Structures are given as structure tokens and as C-alpha cells.
Amino acid sequence: ASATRVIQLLRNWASGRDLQAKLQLRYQEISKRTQPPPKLPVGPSHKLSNNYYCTR
Amino acid sequence: KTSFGSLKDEDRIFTNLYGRHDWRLKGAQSRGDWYKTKEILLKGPDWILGEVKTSGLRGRGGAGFPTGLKWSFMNKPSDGRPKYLVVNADEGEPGTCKDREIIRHDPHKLVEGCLVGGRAMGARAAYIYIRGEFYNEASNLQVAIREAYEAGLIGKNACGSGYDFDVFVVRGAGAYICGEETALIESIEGKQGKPRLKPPFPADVGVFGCPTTVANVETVAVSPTICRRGGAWFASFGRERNSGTKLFNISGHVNHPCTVEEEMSVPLKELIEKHAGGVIGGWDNLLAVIPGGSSTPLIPKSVCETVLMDFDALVQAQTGLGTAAVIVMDRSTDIVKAIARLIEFYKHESCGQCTPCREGVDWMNKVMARFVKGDARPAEIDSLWEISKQIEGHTICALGDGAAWPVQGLIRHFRPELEERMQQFALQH
Numbered sequence A: 001a002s003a004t005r006v007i008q009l010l011r012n013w014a015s016g017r018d019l020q021a022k023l024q025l026r027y028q029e030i031s032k033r034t035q036p037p038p039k040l041p042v043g044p045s046h047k048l049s050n051n052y053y054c055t056r
Numbered sequence B: 001k002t003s004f005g006s007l008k009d010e011d012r013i014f015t016n017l018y019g020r021h022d023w024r025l026k027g028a029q030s031r032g033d034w035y036k037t038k039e040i041l042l043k044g045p046d047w048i049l050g051e052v053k054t055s056g057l058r059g060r061g062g063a064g065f066p067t068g069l070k071w072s073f074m075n076k077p078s079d080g081r082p083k084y085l086v087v088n089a090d091e092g093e094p095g096t097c098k099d100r101e102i103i104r105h106d107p108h109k110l111v112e113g114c115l116v117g118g119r120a121m122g123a124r125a126a127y128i129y130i131r132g133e134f135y136n137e138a139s140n141l142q143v144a145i146r147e148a149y150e151a152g153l154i155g156k157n158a159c160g161s162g163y164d165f166d167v168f169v170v171r172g173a174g175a176y177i178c179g180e181e182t183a184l185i186e187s188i189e190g191k192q193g194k195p196r197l198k199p200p201f202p203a204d205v206g207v208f209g210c211p212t213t214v215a216n217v218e219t220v221a222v223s224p225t226i227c228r229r230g231g232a233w234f235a236s237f238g239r240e241r242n243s244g245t246k247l248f249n250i251s252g253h254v255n256h257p258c259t260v261e262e263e264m265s266v267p268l269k270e271l272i273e274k275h276a277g278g279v280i281g282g283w284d285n286l287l288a289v290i291p292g293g294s295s296t297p298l299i300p301k302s303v304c305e306t307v308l309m310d311f312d313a314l315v316q317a318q319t320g321l322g323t324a325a326v327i328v329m330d331r332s333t334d335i336v337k338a339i340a341r342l343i344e345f346y347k348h349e350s351c352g353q354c355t356p357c358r359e360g361v362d363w364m365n366k367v368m369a370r371f372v373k374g375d376a377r378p379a380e381i382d383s384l385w386e387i388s389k390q391i392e393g394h395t396i397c398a399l400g401d402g403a404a405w406p407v408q409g410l411i412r413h414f415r416p417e418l419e420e421r422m423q424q425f426a427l428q429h
């Protein structure tokens, strides 16, 4: 977070924990909204043989 | 007898098979045909059927069903409908070119067979459905029939025996499906050549809705010789349940492609080498052989090395005698392409009536073309096997089964070639 070192120290002391380590606000660890095109897999019955529905 | 295939010229039913003599009545009678036919007819229908059973004659059209029993099916008291007999002369099975030889070179033998069979089954008349392409053979057959009519061999008081029998010839119009017995019946009746669904069996309801029996040209033509020479004579040749002499239309990659009458249960390699001069390039150059026309599955060279050309032995070899049209394929043959061509033949000769045949055969043809190009995946081979199994046994006629069998044989014996071709195609792209 964009806070002065003094403010950070006061905040951590008042909380009693190092808040800068785990800040609730999300900055850059977020995943990119634009992602590579996925290729989802097929199921166990996506076969051209021994796939008779009577057996499943 | 343990070693078969030593048939002598004194034991060959078709003596003018090569057309080197007079096909007309004079030559036929000089060769022993049309001999004491009156006594044969007066002997009794039961006697004739018993002689056929003693000979152990089985269906020479490909089914292999015992001919004596099949003909005995129609030896019943008349139901009021005029009984008829049909002689299957379509010969549409690829590789099968025997019936043509019989009709064109010994037509009077076939006519005498028709008379004897009709007497044995109490048939009013016989309709020989010949293939339309066999126009000259049909002309020869008609000339023979005219000669028989004028000589009194057939017609009213046939051979002076009192039996009133007629022989009709109906030309086809280019349909392999017409080879099927019920499809043949429908074609004669004037409808599209689409096979019926048994029951009713043809013996009960057949041509013109009358008791009818369909028999192969060879099957009918051997009946008078079987009667005259005795059933024991016919039985002596061939193993038990595989007795007689079968015409072998050796064709393909052989040095001397020809049709030869040889004893049943003859070793395949012997038959190929004895008459056709062996496989082109030698025995080792052979790839595979289709023993019976095209419907029967192929047998690889390993099995071809030691196998008897009879019904039972070939059944053990995952194939059948069928029409005994040996199609020899050398190792310069793309087996995939050949089987695909056969599948295409079936596709272009399917009636289209039954859904499995109509759609599955075309689907298999597409997949086979893709296999020939290698444009596929290895699992598609198992998929094709499943498709063939689905078609087989689920169709009105046996055309679907006889089209599934080649694919099954190709997979079962040369799957490595298919997989390797697919690999090669993948590497190219």
C-alpha cells in the first residue's frame, strides 16, 4: 500500500501484526483478466471403440 | 481317400467347359448329356432328391446349404399355386465367372438339369434369370432351349415322360443385388430388385407368390450327371460334408488366370500352382488370397500355405468356399486399396432397403478410402471393426454381411499395414 513508513509502523503497532505482509486490498498478485485460450479435455467416454452406452 | 484334388477328365461334369466342342444339342448328346432323361424323370421325384442327398451336393452359389434338403423342401403336396423353379444365373459376385462358362458352353446340360430338378420338385416351369450383360450367353441358352423344345426334350410330354415342363430365360438389367434369391424373385416379378425378408421362405412363397426354389447354375447343371453316374460317384470326390467337384475361377495375380473344374477339398496352393501356373513372381511373392468371390474374408499367405479348398476347412480359416473365385494378390498389391475397391463395389451395388446396409456400407467405404490415403487414426480401425459387426447379422440380405466380412478380414490380417500407412501420412504432414 502507498502509505508512509511512519503510518505503516503506527498501523502495525496498533494492530499488533505486520499488516503490510498481508494487505486486504489487491494490487498486482491478481491474475490477469485476459488469459490464454483454454483447451478443456474430454471425458472417459470420448472413445471410438468399446463405448456402447449399454455398458455405461 | 485322404489326398484330394486329383480329378480326372473322366470325372469332370462340365466336358465342354472351355468351349472346344459343340455347345449345341448334338455336341451335348455326344458328350453324354440328355441321356435317358425320360428314365430319370420316370424314376421319381423322391428318387432324384435321394440321389442328390446321396451325392451330398451343397449350394454352389455360395451359401453351401445342402442342395438335396433345399430341393426336398418343395417336394410337398401342391397348395393350389403353380410351383415354379428359378435358376440363378446373375453371377454378379466379383471374381465369379463360372456360371457364364456353363451357360455359354454347356447350355443343354443346364436345361436338362432344369428339367430334372423341376420333376424332382413338381415345378410347372423354370425361369432362368440371366445377367443382362450376358446377352450372348443368353442367346446361346435360348438357342439351346429352342432345340430342346423342337426335339421334345422339354415342353409338354418332356422326353416322352408325360411331364409338362417349360424353361424360361429372363434377362437382368445390371444389379448385383439381383443375385440374392428373394431379390431375384422380386426382379422377375417386375419390382425393384430388393430382397424379401424370410419368413416367408422362398419354398413356400416365391415367384408370383408361388412355391419357388432358387438354385445356382452349377448346382442345377450337376444334377443330371449326379443322377446318371450315381450319388456315390459325386460323393467319392471331396471330403465328407464337402463332397463333389467345384469350378474354381482362379483370377488376379496368377500366371494363367483360368476356370478349371477340380475336386473339392483340394489344397489351395496346389490348385493355384497346378492350373494357374502359380502366383506371379512365385509363391513367396503372394500377399493374400480371397477364396470365394469377394464376400468371403481374405486369408493371408501363412494360412494359404496349407489349406483345403472346401467349405469346412475354409470356415476354419475364417473364410468360406463361396463361389470358389480364387482372387490371388501378390505382394505388389495395396491390400487396403483392393479391399476398398470391393467395399466400393458393395456400395454401388446395395439395394438401399435395410438401414444398416444402406448407410453402414457407404460409411465403411468412406472410412476405407481414408485408410487407403492413411488419413485416419489407429482407433478408427477398431471403430471400423465395430461398424462391420453392427452391419453383419442385422441386415435383410447377406450383401451387408458379405461387405462387412472383407473389412474384418483386412483388419484381422493386415492391421499393421493400415497403422503404418496412417503413420506415414502423419509424417508427411
Ligand SMILES: Cc1cc2nc3c(=O)[nH]c(=O)nc-3n(C[C@H](O)[C@H](O)[C@H](O)COP(=O)(O)O)c2cc1C
Pocket: B058, B059, B060, B061, B062, B063, B064, B065, B070, B088, B089, B090, B091, B092, B093, B176, B177, B178, B179, B180, B181, B182, B214, B215, B216, B217, B219, B397, B398, B399, B402
Ligand atoms: C448379395 C448376394 C449376391 C448373390 N449373388 C449370387 C450369384 O451371383 N449367383 C448365385 O448363384 N447366387 C448368388 N447369391 C446367393 C443366392 O441368394 C442364393 O442363395 C443362391 O442363388 C442359391 O444357390 P444354391 O441353390 O446353389 O445354394 C447371392 C446372394 C447375395 C446375398
Ligand code: SF4
Pocket: B177, B194, B195, B349, B350, B351, B352, B353, B354, B355, B356, B357, B358, B395, B396, B397, B398, B399, B400, B401
Ligand atoms: S444388406 Fe442391403 S440395404 Fe440390404 S436388403 Fe441389402 S443390398 Fe440391402
